[PDB]
Design a protein around this ligand. Structure first.
Ligand SMILES: Nc1nc(C(F)(F)F)ncc1COP(=O)(O)OP(=O)(O)O
Ligand SMILES: [Mg+2]
Length: 219
Protein backbone atom coordinates (compact mmCIF):
# COMPACT_ATOMS: atom_id res chain seq x y z
CA UNK A 1 0.00 0.00 0.00
CA UNK A 2 1.78 3.07 -1.30
CA UNK A 3 0.64 6.54 -2.30
CA UNK A 4 -2.62 6.08 -4.22
CA UNK A 5 -2.82 7.80 -7.60
CA UNK A 6 -6.32 6.43 -8.26
CA UNK A 7 -9.46 5.79 -6.22
CA UNK A 8 -9.41 2.41 -4.46
CA UNK A 9 -11.51 -0.28 -6.12
CA UNK A 10 -14.61 -1.71 -4.48
CA UNK A 11 -13.19 -5.23 -4.71
CA UNK A 12 -10.01 -4.24 -2.86
CA UNK A 13 -11.83 -1.94 -0.44
CA UNK A 14 -14.29 -4.69 0.47
CA UNK A 15 -11.46 -7.16 1.11
CA UNK A 16 -9.91 -4.74 3.62
CA UNK A 17 -13.09 -4.17 5.65
CA UNK A 18 -13.34 -7.87 6.63
CA UNK A 19 -11.81 -7.55 10.11
CA UNK A 20 -11.45 -3.82 10.79
CA UNK A 21 -9.76 -3.01 14.12
CA UNK A 22 -10.35 0.42 15.66
CA UNK A 23 -8.40 1.54 18.72
CA UNK A 24 -7.11 4.32 20.97
CA UNK A 25 -4.81 4.34 24.01
CA UNK A 26 -7.84 4.46 26.29
CA UNK A 27 -9.55 1.37 24.89
CA UNK A 28 -7.13 -1.10 26.52
CA UNK A 29 -5.42 -1.78 29.84
CA UNK A 30 -2.28 -3.13 28.19
CA UNK A 31 0.30 -1.46 26.01
CA UNK A 32 -1.53 0.37 23.18
CA UNK A 33 0.96 -0.36 20.41
CA UNK A 34 1.57 -3.93 21.62
CA UNK A 35 -2.15 -4.63 21.31
CA UNK A 36 -2.25 -3.25 17.78
CA UNK A 37 0.74 -5.35 16.73
CA UNK A 38 -1.04 -8.44 18.06
CA UNK A 39 -4.28 -7.56 16.35
CA UNK A 40 -2.41 -7.35 13.05
CA UNK A 41 -0.35 -10.49 13.71
CA UNK A 42 -3.72 -12.09 14.27
CA UNK A 43 -5.39 -11.25 10.98
CA UNK A 44 -6.93 -7.77 11.17
CA UNK A 45 -7.15 -6.50 7.59
CA UNK A 46 -7.45 -2.80 8.32
CA UNK A 47 -6.75 -0.53 11.27
CA UNK A 48 -8.06 2.86 12.33
CA UNK A 49 -6.21 5.14 14.68
CA UNK A 50 -8.91 6.59 16.93
CA UNK A 51 -7.50 8.74 19.75
CA UNK A 52 -10.00 10.96 21.55
CA UNK A 53 -12.01 11.54 24.71
CA UNK A 54 -11.13 11.39 28.38
CA UNK A 55 -7.98 9.34 28.88
CA UNK A 56 -6.72 10.12 25.40
CA UNK A 57 -3.27 11.38 24.41
CA UNK A 58 -2.86 14.89 23.00
CA UNK A 59 -0.15 17.01 21.42
CA UNK A 60 3.15 15.37 20.53
CA UNK A 61 2.36 12.30 22.64
CA UNK A 62 -0.60 11.55 20.36
CA UNK A 63 1.34 12.06 17.12
CA UNK A 64 4.18 9.74 18.15
CA UNK A 65 1.70 7.06 19.25
CA UNK A 66 0.16 7.39 15.78
CA UNK A 67 3.52 6.99 14.08
CA UNK A 68 4.19 3.82 16.02
CA UNK A 69 0.79 2.38 15.21
CA UNK A 70 1.31 3.27 11.55
CA UNK A 71 4.75 1.65 11.62
CA UNK A 72 3.24 -1.57 12.95
CA UNK A 73 0.67 -1.45 10.13
CA UNK A 74 3.54 -1.06 7.67
CA UNK A 75 5.31 -4.21 8.89
CA UNK A 76 2.09 -6.23 8.70
CA UNK A 77 1.30 -4.74 5.29
CA UNK A 78 -2.14 -3.51 6.42
CA UNK A 79 -3.52 -0.04 5.58
CA UNK A 80 -3.36 2.61 8.30
CA UNK A 81 -6.54 4.66 8.66
CA UNK A 82 -6.91 7.82 10.76
CA UNK A 83 -10.13 8.99 12.42
CA UNK A 84 -11.64 12.51 12.41
CA UNK A 85 -8.28 14.30 12.05
CA UNK A 86 -7.67 15.10 8.37
CA UNK A 87 -4.56 17.23 9.08
CA UNK A 88 -2.83 14.31 10.81
CA UNK A 89 -3.90 11.82 8.13
CA UNK A 90 -2.15 13.91 5.49
CA UNK A 91 0.97 14.53 7.57
CA UNK A 92 1.64 10.87 8.30
CA UNK A 93 0.72 10.05 4.71
CA UNK A 94 -1.92 7.67 6.04
CA UNK A 95 -3.77 5.32 3.71
CA UNK A 96 -7.09 6.78 4.73
CA UNK A 97 -9.29 8.93 6.93
CA UNK A 98 -12.67 8.24 8.51
CA UNK A 99 -15.39 10.80 9.27
CA UNK A 100 -18.84 10.94 10.82
CA UNK A 101 -21.89 13.17 10.38
CA UNK A 102 -20.64 15.74 12.89
CA UNK A 103 -17.11 15.89 11.48
CA UNK A 104 -15.85 17.90 8.50
CA UNK A 105 -18.03 17.62 5.40
CA UNK A 106 -17.12 14.64 3.23
CA UNK A 107 -16.96 16.84 0.11
CA UNK A 108 -14.22 19.00 1.62
CA UNK A 109 -12.31 16.06 3.04
CA UNK A 110 -12.36 14.26 -0.32
CA UNK A 111 -10.99 17.36 -2.02
CA UNK A 112 -8.22 17.69 0.57
CA UNK A 113 -7.13 14.01 0.58
CA UNK A 114 -6.83 13.31 -3.14
CA UNK A 115 -7.25 9.59 -3.78
CA UNK A 116 -6.75 8.49 -0.18
CA UNK A 117 -9.23 6.00 1.24
CA UNK A 118 -12.32 7.70 2.68
CA UNK A 119 -14.73 6.19 5.18
CA UNK A 120 -18.01 7.81 6.17
CA UNK A 121 -20.23 6.84 9.10
CA UNK A 122 -23.87 6.48 8.00
CA UNK A 123 -27.03 5.89 10.02
CA UNK A 124 -29.81 6.46 7.48
CA UNK A 125 -30.46 5.64 3.83
CA UNK A 126 -30.07 9.35 3.09
CA UNK A 127 -26.65 9.61 4.74
CA UNK A 128 -25.51 6.52 2.83
CA UNK A 129 -26.59 7.92 -0.53
CA UNK A 130 -25.00 11.26 0.33
CA UNK A 131 -21.76 9.60 1.43
CA UNK A 132 -21.55 7.88 -1.94
CA UNK A 133 -21.90 11.04 -4.00
CA UNK A 134 -19.63 12.90 -1.59
CA UNK A 135 -16.98 10.47 -2.80
CA UNK A 136 -16.68 8.03 0.12
CA UNK A 137 -14.96 4.69 -0.60
CA UNK A 138 -17.00 2.90 2.08
CA UNK A 139 -19.45 3.57 4.93
CA UNK A 140 -19.74 2.38 8.51
CA UNK A 141 -23.34 1.57 9.36
CA UNK A 142 -24.51 1.26 12.97
CA UNK A 143 -24.54 1.09 15.95
CA UNK A 144 -25.60 -2.47 15.19
CA UNK A 145 -25.36 -3.66 18.79
CA UNK A 146 -25.32 -1.99 22.24
CA UNK A 147 -25.83 7.18 22.55
CA UNK A 148 -26.82 6.89 18.83
CA UNK A 149 -29.66 4.34 18.55
CA UNK A 150 -28.89 0.66 17.93
CA UNK A 151 -30.19 -0.51 14.53
CA UNK A 152 -29.30 -4.19 14.17
CA UNK A 153 -28.67 -5.02 10.52
CA UNK A 154 -31.83 -3.27 9.30
CA UNK A 155 -30.11 -0.38 7.50
CA UNK A 156 -27.53 -2.76 6.05
CA UNK A 157 -30.41 -4.77 4.63
CA UNK A 158 -32.22 -1.70 3.34
CA UNK A 159 -29.09 -0.53 1.50
CA UNK A 160 -28.61 -3.83 -0.30
CA UNK A 161 -32.33 -4.00 -1.11
CA UNK A 162 -32.08 -0.74 -3.05
CA UNK A 163 -29.35 -2.43 -5.09
CA UNK A 164 -26.56 -0.17 -3.74
CA UNK A 165 -23.18 -1.95 -3.76
CA UNK A 166 -21.03 0.57 -1.87
CA UNK A 167 -18.50 -1.15 0.44
CA UNK A 168 -20.00 -1.57 3.91
CA UNK A 169 -18.43 -2.29 7.29
CA UNK A 170 -20.58 -2.85 10.36
CA UNK A 171 -19.89 -1.13 13.67
CA UNK A 172 -21.23 -1.34 17.21
CA UNK A 173 -20.82 -3.90 19.99
CA UNK A 174 -19.60 -6.51 17.54
CA UNK A 175 -18.20 -9.67 19.13
CA UNK A 176 -17.04 -13.00 17.73
CA UNK A 177 -20.46 -14.38 18.63
CA UNK A 178 -22.61 -11.76 16.88
CA UNK A 179 -20.52 -10.89 13.82
CA UNK A 180 -21.96 -13.47 11.36
CA UNK A 181 -25.43 -11.89 10.94
CA UNK A 182 -23.79 -8.57 10.09
CA UNK A 183 -22.06 -10.29 7.17
CA UNK A 184 -25.10 -12.32 6.18
CA UNK A 185 -27.08 -9.08 6.06
CA UNK A 186 -24.72 -8.05 3.27
CA UNK A 187 -21.95 -6.14 5.04
CA UNK A 188 -18.44 -6.51 3.62
CA UNK A 189 -16.85 -6.62 7.07
CA UNK A 190 -17.17 -5.91 10.79
CA UNK A 191 -15.55 -3.28 13.02
CA UNK A 192 -14.59 -3.81 16.65
CA UNK A 193 -12.66 -2.15 19.45
CA UNK A 194 -13.18 -3.93 22.79
CA UNK A 195 -13.86 -7.40 21.35
CA UNK A 196 -10.14 -7.34 20.50
CA UNK A 197 -8.55 -4.45 22.41
CA UNK A 198 -9.81 -5.85 25.70
CA UNK A 199 -9.41 -9.55 24.96
CA UNK A 200 -6.88 -11.23 27.21
CA UNK A 201 -5.47 -12.60 23.96
CA UNK A 202 -5.90 -9.95 21.19
CA UNK A 203 -3.87 -11.95 18.65
CA UNK A 204 -6.07 -15.02 18.88
CA UNK A 205 -9.17 -12.83 19.03
CA UNK A 206 -8.27 -11.19 15.72
CA UNK A 207 -7.46 -14.63 14.31
CA UNK A 208 -10.91 -15.97 15.19
CA UNK A 209 -12.62 -13.02 13.51
CA UNK A 210 -10.50 -13.61 10.39
CA UNK A 211 -11.58 -17.26 10.14
CA UNK A 212 -15.25 -16.60 10.89
CA UNK A 213 -15.58 -13.60 8.56
CA UNK A 214 -13.97 -15.43 5.65
CA UNK A 215 -16.27 -18.40 6.26
CA UNK A 216 -19.38 -16.27 6.21
CA UNK A 217 -18.43 -14.06 3.28
CA UNK A 218 -17.98 -17.21 1.18
CA UNK A 219 -21.33 -18.60 2.33
N1 LIG B 1 -15.29 5.82 13.96
C1 LIG B 1 -16.14 5.15 13.18
N2 LIG B 1 -15.57 4.20 12.35
C2 LIG B 1 -16.36 3.51 11.56
C3 LIG B 1 -15.80 2.49 10.67
F1 LIG B 1 -16.50 2.42 9.56
F2 LIG B 1 -14.55 2.79 10.38
F3 LIG B 1 -15.81 1.30 11.24
N3 LIG B 1 -17.72 3.70 11.53
C4 LIG B 1 -18.31 4.64 12.32
C5 LIG B 1 -17.58 5.40 13.18
C6 LIG B 1 -18.25 6.43 14.06
O1 LIG B 1 -17.81 7.74 13.64
P1 LIG B 1 -18.26 8.99 14.48
O2 LIG B 1 -19.69 9.07 14.79
O3 LIG B 1 -17.74 10.06 13.61
O4 LIG B 1 -17.52 9.00 15.89
P2 LIG B 1 -16.10 8.63 16.43
O5 LIG B 1 -15.13 9.42 15.64
O6 LIG B 1 -16.24 9.02 17.85
O7 LIG B 1 -16.02 7.20 16.21
MG1 LIG C 1 -15.96 10.91 14.09
Amino acid sequence: HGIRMTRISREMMKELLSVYFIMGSNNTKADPVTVVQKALKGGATLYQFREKGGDALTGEARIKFAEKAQAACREAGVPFIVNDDVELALNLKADGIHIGQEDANAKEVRAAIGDMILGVAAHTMSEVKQAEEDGADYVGLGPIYPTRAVQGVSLIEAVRRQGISIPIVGIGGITIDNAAPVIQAGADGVSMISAISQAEDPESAARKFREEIQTYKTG
